Structures are given as C-alpha cells and as structure tokens.
Ligand binder design. Structure first.
Ligand SMILES: [Cl-]
Ligand SMILES: [Cl-]
Ligand SMILES: [Cl-]
Ligand SMILES: [Cl-]
Ligand SMILES: [Cl-]
Ligand SMILES: [Cl-]
Ligand SMILES: [Cl-]
Ligand SMILES: [Cl-]
Ligand SMILES: [Cl-]
Ligand SMILES: [Cl-]
Ligand SMILES: [Cl-]
Ligand SMILES: [Cl-]
Ligand SMILES: [K+]
Ligand SMILES: [K+]
Ligand SMILES: [K+]
Ligand SMILES: [K+]
Ligand SMILES: [K+]
Lengths: 281, 283, 282, 282, 282
C-alpha cells in the first residue's frame, strides 16, 4: 500500500457509445507493400478479449471486447483523457442495460475506449448503445515518490499490480522489457494521458518472449512519458498495458497505454511469467 | 475429409446497418432498346422475392431479395460491404421483429446494400429504418493446403456445406452454370472483390445455356481473376460466385454475382450440376 | 371473370413515409379573381373530409382527404410517389394507432403526398410524424390480351372491382363523367404519369356537365395520352383516372386526377354511370 | 465526299468547367497482383503526356493527357460529360493563357473530366482552376442514309476526317485494332455511352495483338452495342471508339475508350490500318 | 550517373496556396511540462531559410521559407504525395506572380509543402497567393539497384547529391547517421511518400554533431521506409533531408523526408562535413 492522494481525486461521468467496426478501405497495407482484406478496429469484437494473445489473428488493430467512441468530436478529449484502465463501465441503453464492465485500454486516432464485459453480455449489445464510464484516476500521485508519475490507471486496480516499494525503489512485475527503438506510431502525441502508442514488433519473438497478450504489463526502456508521448531519454523507464492486437503496416503493432513513468534509478521492472490485468477484474 | 483452414484465427465483429428504403433515382428504368419502363427496383423489404427464386421473370430491375440493409452513414459503408459474408448471422435489433434472426444472402455495390433472408413471418413485422446487426465473419479465411486458391465473402460454416471437395491437389466445386468472361459487365474494375458484386449481363437465362438462373445459385466465371480488384480477364483463371440479385433491363447489367473463390483452372474444377443453391442450407 | 394480367410477375415492396403536417406557404390562397382568402390547404390528418365526399363545397384549397403521407427525406420522394398504387394496403408503424390498416386513395404531386383512408376511429389516435408503411404493388401491371391499353397506379385487386369488362377486343369502363382535354390544367408535362396527379380545372362540377364530382370518382379524360409523361393532347386518345383531392381556388387548378389507364378510343369505351367511386370497394 | 448528316439541325452550346487538380484518394494504387505503388494518377495539367503518345509505358495510372477539365459543381457534371464531343473547340477564359484555343481529345467518367489538347506553349501558362469554355457540338448527329448506324461523342467536322467511307450501303472505318468484348472492363453498365468512357483491360498492348496502343487511337470493339447504356454484349454488334487515357494498374482497368459509333457488323466494317489517330487531324 | 527510368515518369501540376501561420493555442508545451509562447509553422517565414541551423530559434516546428497548403482537404493527398524535393515552384497570383522557387521539403499533419524563393521575392508574397508545383519524381527507380528504393526527390536534384555507384553498392554523403531510437513523431504514417518524420533530438549534440541544418542530408539507421514510415528493422538504412526546425514537445524535433531506403549491404552512408540541398537547388 503506497501513500497516494487517492482521496483528492475527482470521479466523474464520461460518456460514449458503442462504436461501429471501422474501415477506411477494404485493404490493409502490409510492411511488404501488399494488400490484405481483414477485419480492423471498432465494434463489438466477439472472439478477442483481454487476456488473449495480441498475435495470431487474421486482423489489424483489432480491439478486444467493446469499443466505445464519443457522441461527437467535442467529447473525444475527455473520453480519452479521463478514462482509466480498470474504471467501472455501465451500459445505459439497449438490451444489456445495467450490465457492468471495466476499461481495458484506449486507442488514440479513432479515439476508442476499450471495455471488457462478461461474455453473456456481448450478444445483447448493439452498436450505438449508450455507455457510462465512471472515470477515476487522473491526478493520482505517489506521495513518497514524487518523481515517479502515474496515470491512466484506476487507483484500486493500481494496488493489484504486484508493485512493491522496497528501499525507496518501485518494483514492478512485467512480462517483457521493450527497447525504445521498438516503439513506433503514437510517439509525439500531445499527452500520454490520452492515447496509446505502438510496439512495432511483427512477432512476439522479436521482443524476446513466446507471446504477448492483450492486458499484459510491459516496461518501455529509455522512454519518458511524463507529458507528451515517447521522448527518448537514456535511463528513463515507462510501465504500460498492452491494449490492442498486432498490426500489418509499417510502424504499427500492439498498442501500449502508459501507467507509470520515471527514472531507472526509481522504477525496477522485474520480468515474470505472467502479469496481466485480466487476472484482476 | 475436412478442408484445412485458418478458421480459428478469424476475427468475428459487429457490423451494423438499418433496413434500406426502396430506392429510385427516376420513375423510369432505361432498357437496352432505349425505351423506358416504370417498375420496382432495389432496396426495401421485398415481400415476394426471396433467395431460391428465379432471378428472371420479375417485372422489376435490380430487385434485391428479402431485406436490403444499408449503412447508418457513408463512413460506415466500407465495413458493412467488406466484412459482411454470405451465410453470416443477422439479428434484428429494433422494431416489432426485434430478436429475429436471419442470414446474409448477398451484397450489392453502388447503393451498398447487404441482403438478408428472414423467415417469411418476420418480414411483415419489419420496418424501413429498423436496426440490423450482422455478426461479420469470414474475411481472412484461407485454405491452408491450397494457398493459391483464394476464398472470400463466405461464412466459414456455410462454405463447408457447398459440396466442395479436395482431390489430387485440386478443388472440385458444384455449380449450376459456367459463365464466359464476356458475359460479365457492370462492376468490373471495382477496387476489391471483397466489397461488391458484379453483373452477369444475360438478358435471358438461355443466353447462359440454362433453363433458369436462381437467386442463391453457385456459378463459375471463366477466365476472370478476382483476387484483388474485380473482373480481371485472364485466360485460365476461374472464379466461383453466388447469384445475389435479379435480372436487369439496362445495357451492361444483369443478375449480380458475389465472388467466394478465385484462382487457376489447374486447381479449381467447376462441375455442372442440376442444383447448387445456398437457400438449401439457409431457408 | 378476370382479364388476363401479369399479376404474378409483379414485385411487392415496402414503401415508407410519415404523416405529413398541414402545409401552407402563405396564409393566403390567391383566387382566379385575383383576391385572397385565408383557408386550410393540403397535408395533415383531415378529420372532416374523406374519400367518397364531394370534391366541391369546402372552404379550402387542395384539401387532401384522410391522411397525407410524405417522405422521410427528399431522396425517398420518387419511390414513394411512383410505387404507391391506389388501393394498396397501408399500415401504421408507430404512435398510438400502431397496427391500424388503411388503403391508398390517391397521391398528389409537388408536395408529393400519398393519401390514405383509415377507419374513422383511427384518425383521432394519429399524430403528424407517425411512421407509415405502404405495401406497394401494381406498377408493372399489363393486360396480356390488350397490349395497347396501358394500366398503372392501381392495386391489381382493386382493379378487378371497377366493373371493367372485356368484349370484342375492347374495354368498357364505368365512369361518372367524361372530361374534355381543355379542362385539364396543372400537372400536364410531369415526367411520368406514374408519379403524380393532374388537375381538372373546373370551378364548379356543373362545368363538367355533372351535379357533383366526388373524391374517389372514376372519370375519363378525352383526347389525352398518359402512357409516359402527363397530359399529351392527342385526338382519339382516352385516359381513365381517379379523383384524389378537392377543388381549388387558383387559376389552372381543381380536383386532382391520378391516371390508372390510357390508350386509344378504339379500345377503351368509357360508359357514363350514376356512380363509380372507389370508396365503394374499400 | 461527305456522308449525308443532320449537321444543320444540331445545337451548339456553351459547356463550362475549370482546370481540374491532380486527384488522388490514396497515395497508393493497388495493382492486379495485390501490391501497392506510389505513382501519379488522373487530373491536372499533365506536362509530359499528350494525345498521340503511347497509352502504355508510363509510371502512372489513369493518366489523362494534356489538360483535365472538371465541372464547377456537381450539378454541372452531366452536361459537361454529355455535350462535350471529341474534336470540339475549347477556349481558355481566365488566367495567363486567356484566349488560347484547344480541342477536346476525350472524356473520362467517374471523376468526370473532359480532356483537352492545347499547344505546348500554352501549358506552361495554365493554372488549376482556370476557367474553360467548351463549344459543345455533335450530340444529335445522325447519318441520314444509315439510320441503324448510331454516332455520338464526335465533333461533325472531326468525324469527316476519320477516313470513313460509304460503299454498298455499309460503312468502312479505319482502326488500329479490333478488341474482343471480353477485353472491356470498368464502365460497362454506365447509363449512357454519351457521358463516359470504358476501359480496355489489357495490361500490355501485345494482349491486343498490336505492338502499341496510343492515346487518340481509333479502335473497334467487337460484339458490344453502345446505343444506349455502355457495353451490352451482343454477338454481331460492333462499336468504334477513341482511346482517351493511359494504361492502368488495377484489376478491370486500362486505356479508356469513348465510343463514337455503334451498330451491326453487317453495316460497319472496321478495317485494320497501321495508323488511325485523332492527333493527325488536330 | 545512375541508370534510371526517368523516361517513364509523369510530370503533373500540383497546386496549393501560401498557408497562414498556424497555431491551435498560444502555448507550446515543452518536454518539461511548461508552456512557452513562440512562433510555430506555416506562413512566409522571413528570417529562416534552407541552409540555416534547425536549432537556436525561439520557435517550434518552424518551416523555412514559404509554406504551401492545399486549397481544400481533398487536394491534400496529391499535394503531399507528388511534390518532390527540388521540384520547380511557380507563383501564379499576387505581386510576385511569375517568380520561381524550389521545393525544400514537406511536413505531414498540417500538410505543407515547403518552398525556397530568392529573398527579394518573399517581401512581395501574401498568404493565399496561388502556387503551382511542377511535380516530378514519384515512380523513380534505379534500374541497376532494384532493392534500393528512391522517392520524394526531383531526379535532377538526385544527380547532384554526390551519390556514387561502386561494386553494386551506393555511397551517399551525409552529415550524420541517426539511430532508430532518435526517430519519433510520424512513425506509422501510411506512406513515406506523403510525410516527414521527426528526429527527437533536443540539441544537435544529441546526434554527435555541432549543428544540424535545414536541407541537411542524413542517414537513419535500422529503419525501413519502403511503404509506411519508420519500420524498425536491423540492418535497414534510410537517407533523408532535414525539412523543418527543432521542436519543444516530447517526441518532436527536426523533420526528415526520406529520399532513399534499402539494406546496409547496398547503401553506404559516408559522413562528411557538409551535405546540404541549399548548395544545389539552383
Ligand atoms: Cl475484452
Ligand atoms: Cl534503443
Ligand atoms: Cl431472401
Ligand atoms: Cl493451391
Ligand atoms: Cl470470353
Ligand atoms: Cl379518406
Ligand atoms: Cl365559403
Ligand atoms: Cl378539347
Ligand atoms: Cl493532349
Ligand atoms: Cl516503372
Ligand atoms: Cl469475346
Ligand atoms: Cl527557404
Ligand atoms: K472491439
Ligand atoms: K429488398
Ligand atoms: K389530409
Ligand atoms: K491531365
Ligand atoms: K514558412
């Protein structure tokens, strides 16, 4: 139990609706300059869920579970900014009205918040159904570690990640440690609070692991995410969550939402067999 | 045996639309003879034309069987048309027939409608504008032992019921007709065979050497490759498709075909049978 | 005893709209005398005026009996107006009168309304904007033994009730009046007779040689061909139509007529009767 | 020695547009092999490609020779595409090349461009958005002694220079190639042959049995009737057209053809020559 | 001089207009989470030009010379795709009408093409003035080096970069070799033909050099740019041109437009004191 400002934090209604499956072209362009016709992002994805492999799908940018978009452009920034991984989500219209889930991730660009509901719910949902996220976590501070920034994470979920304070150093279980040069699309976004960015590994063996799963906790080496996304800084480290599937185009791959950032003197990622948010929700 | 596929890597996703109105841009349809007729066209809930019926003998043009489903907005057309596969499950999500289930029978480019079969009882309860969920599944499908035979636009479970067989490294496919390249018209050159149909421009089924061509029929198209864009003429290529809409009165138009398979004549052997119609595995 | 038709080749399709508001572009209607009157006009649920009533004797202009049905949007107007046939079944799909059934009595071009008769009890439950389904059926209808006699705008089952008879390779049609070409005004020239009405510009029914002209009445128009566009003057042509809206106050307007049959006087013999009104066959 | 025409009954009218930008909906063009290329496409002032040049051998897709002319707005696209005939006079009405004159070489449907040849000196003074006047003339043209041979899309004065000859109640037409029906792709089914081109989907000119196919070339299309809509397969029909745009990389596309004549093989006898190219008759 | 396909290449009018200076906020957010009020991108920038340091200006994303934007959104793709570094630019309206310049770079997101004119021209220019780019270079291939891709570069300017063939390998003068990890904003764009991407060096010394100048030729180690932008692959190498100034926000820095990409076994960057396109535009 780290000391935080949890009691100072503001909890607020963030609304959206279930997003349709989205495609701007039938074709996805590969790194080899070839075209494939495959499903992409958005929608209710019936057979890909948090906890599944990010790899091995005939798809691109596939978002697990339910994708939630804004009612209109003006409402995209708060949706994307305030929604934190692990926040409670309630279905507010349609046949699954009253059903509860949790935020697994968010994806910038199209600006989707990604949500896990129990399987039985998914078959009752419809594109356009109203969604309430009870947004809570931005503003979170570690009072004993002011140089370690945290974000994008529900404070109750934060306490279940196996993070231990030992000797003024913050030990964090991770499945993999990713070099700065493996990060691609999304570097330079205005705020790490409001988007993911991509690990451009075409295969999980490129990251030194047999598999990378949606919901996995990873370390990003030599990236500072305190403000904008993806600042290369030797000795910086970031901790994040894997939020979407593998991708076919140059510079893309499984998305990561940052939950912690600071110096390698303070944050010690420790490689374990399993570290996945699906285990706690 | 069972064709080896990548079925388990396939993504299943919600594709949304709404029941389309009957659409007409003019009261008149222009014939091949340069005359005008006033007849029903595409869109809507068509009450007396269904998958399994003849594509011919209707006083109509581009008539779409059953329920025509359009996008909620233009931006949603590409996924509707691309991801929706013949045989996919369809659920009515608003109106008096809410909870009713049907199947995708076809899709038609231009207006960009996905065509759906529901049991006859359901049709009398439907209303234009009613919300429609397609549980889209099939794009990405590969035959793991036949890499040079491309498949598309087809629900994997429905694909298994088409009487298709592996032998001697070749795929045998039952069809009602084999259609020459020169009989294909409107829709050649579309960007992607995954997202449209193209027309057989036969005025009469006898022009194809058959007594009838029915909505839902499986046909072969000779000397057309449909791997990427639509309707590349190539000597020795063969495509398999499904008939999806009715006969048409204007030059270059006729019953629509959605391609489900394409490759080389050395690998795909269409074999002419009396009956090969998806309604047998769907109505 | 039916005429041979291609009825079985005809396509039945959903045509949608919604109950139209009462519409007025000005408070005033301009008369043929160049004066102004403030009176109700077209659109709406008209509580007071119905198929079978006189087209004359109302303090109103272009009054549409029963329920006026318009398109959801402009792009849907053509199929609404083209495919909807007199006598087609109509079903209320939203609001308090949801499930109620009626019949198309007519259609009026310009504002593009299809006009619908429901039972009187229904009207008081209806609201402007309530959703309407027309089960459109009849366009494409051909008389297989009379290829030169064109039919349109008419539900085939209603067509069989009009007292029309084959004899000697000709068609006898009961009508209340036969209207000269020069009595037809507004709507001549419309692209298609399938998609609109045109006006009988008689100020009084006596101008037509009859004591009354009623909404629903079956009439002949002499020397007009309506095979394609509306109102082609041709000596010896004859058209048959149905009266669909009320008398009118402005020059060139009057009770509207939707054409259901057109051909030559050698083939179509209108025969004047006391009564020929579609309300009798609801 | 002219054919008898209704030339004097034809209406000459102003058709306007403006110089179109280069247009691309994606940086990539998708090939028949399912790969992507980044290359120039249609629209614009193409400095480098002109009527008379090969339709093949460019690193490009749908490249339109000379100056591409589009409509000021969507509502003006139909008359632009319909009335503009190959060989019509074109006048620059604004910008630095104001007063310069050129000739219509073709037109391309979809984006709806009319393609124009100006002298080379003019091109360097032109700007996208400069105003363009086409003196449209030729739609309505009939061959008075060959009623079953339809002509279209062609300036009558240009028509007289094509080496076409009457003999024995038949029409002999010089062509560089005769193209089978099955070689025609994109554009089949368009409402009207008067308002668009359609594509020869040959990847290489050798697929057509010729060493080269040039922009401006006169070709025959075997077994296609183009009297009304585009590309009706009919055994024994023959069409004559002009090649109007470059080879293409996607399935079902290739050099575009605007039809100028259509009828039966009993009346129209295409005769293969070494050269038949409209650039010779500017 | 390398064998190319220069002869198949299409040259086409790409238009735009001079862009205003653009700011979405008065504040620019730094890597330290502070705000500064400083000039940004767009406009005619009077005192920053190709050849100047990318660093040491109190500004963010500063674009040298004249920033050119599309007339409308639909025209952005061709502007950004077809415009090649070194292409000729002609002013088509305003007080400097007829003045010629050269493309120095392009910048994705806002989608500006950057242009160098002689200094005297700049004082005559106005935001909104019409701009013609004679676009030429996309489609360029090295016929003897099929696995070395080139792009975004005027073929004549390409021949001035001191690039030499020896032993089936390509030697390229560069001022710096930049590690993959120093590349940020713009990775993952659909096409390297239509955007730049950022070197996120806060200071030039972060790249092992005293200075990095606008117009500098650089190597990016372990990035493949054949299709989409910034694919990390060990052993790939890309060559690019520095196109805009240093940036204050995380993940941004001087922008690079890629002109060549391939394998380290074929492309040999060689570090020199000076390699800058300002030495050769004209
Ligand atoms: Cl999930
Ligand atoms: Cl690194
Ligand atoms: Cl059906
Ligand atoms: Cl194979
Ligand atoms: Cl053939
Ligand atoms: Cl009534
Ligand atoms: Cl009164
Ligand atoms: Cl008269
Ligand atoms: Cl030209
Ligand atoms: Cl090439
Ligand atoms: Cl053929
Ligand atoms: Cl400059
Ligand atoms: K999803
Ligand atoms: K339908
Ligand atoms: K009414
Ligand atoms: K051009
Ligand atoms: K500038």
């Amino acid at each position: 139990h780290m000391r935080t400002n949890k009691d100072r934090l503001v909890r607020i209604s963030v609304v959206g609706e279930i997003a349709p499956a989205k495609m701007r072209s039938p074709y996805s362009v590969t790194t080899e300059g070839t075209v494939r016709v495959i499903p992409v992002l958005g929608g209710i994805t019936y057979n890909v869920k948090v906890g599944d492999s990010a790899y091995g799908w005939a798809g691109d940018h596939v978002e697990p579970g339910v994708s939630v978009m804004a009612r209109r452009k003006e409402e995209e920034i708060p949706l994307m900014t305030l929604s934190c991984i692990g926040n409670e989500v309630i279905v507010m219209s349609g046949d699954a009205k009253g059903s509860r889930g949790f935020v697994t991730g968010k994806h910038g660009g199209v600006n989707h918040v990604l949500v896990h509901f129990e399987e039985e719910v998914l078959g009752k949902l419809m594109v356009g159904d109203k969604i309430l996220i009870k947004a809570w976590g931005q503003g979170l501070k570690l009072l004993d570690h002011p140089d370690v920034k945290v974000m994008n994470i529900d404070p109750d979920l934060f306490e279940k990640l196996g993070i231990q304070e030992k000797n003024g150093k913050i030990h964090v279980p991770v499945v993999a440690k990713i070099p700065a040069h493996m990060m691609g699309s999304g570097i330079g976004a205005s705020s790490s609070a409001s988007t993911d960015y991509d690990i451009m590994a075409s295969n999980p063996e490129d990251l030194g692991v047999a598999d990378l799963k949606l919901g996995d906790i990873v370390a990003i080496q030599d990236h500072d995410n305190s403000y904008g996304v993806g600042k290369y800084r030797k000795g910086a480290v970031s901790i994040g969550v894997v939020v979407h599937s593998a991708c076919v185009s140059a510079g893309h791959g499984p998305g990561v939402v940052v939950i912690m950032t600071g110096d390698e003197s303070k944050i010690l990622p420790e490689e374990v067999e399993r570290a996945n948010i699906s285990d706690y929700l």
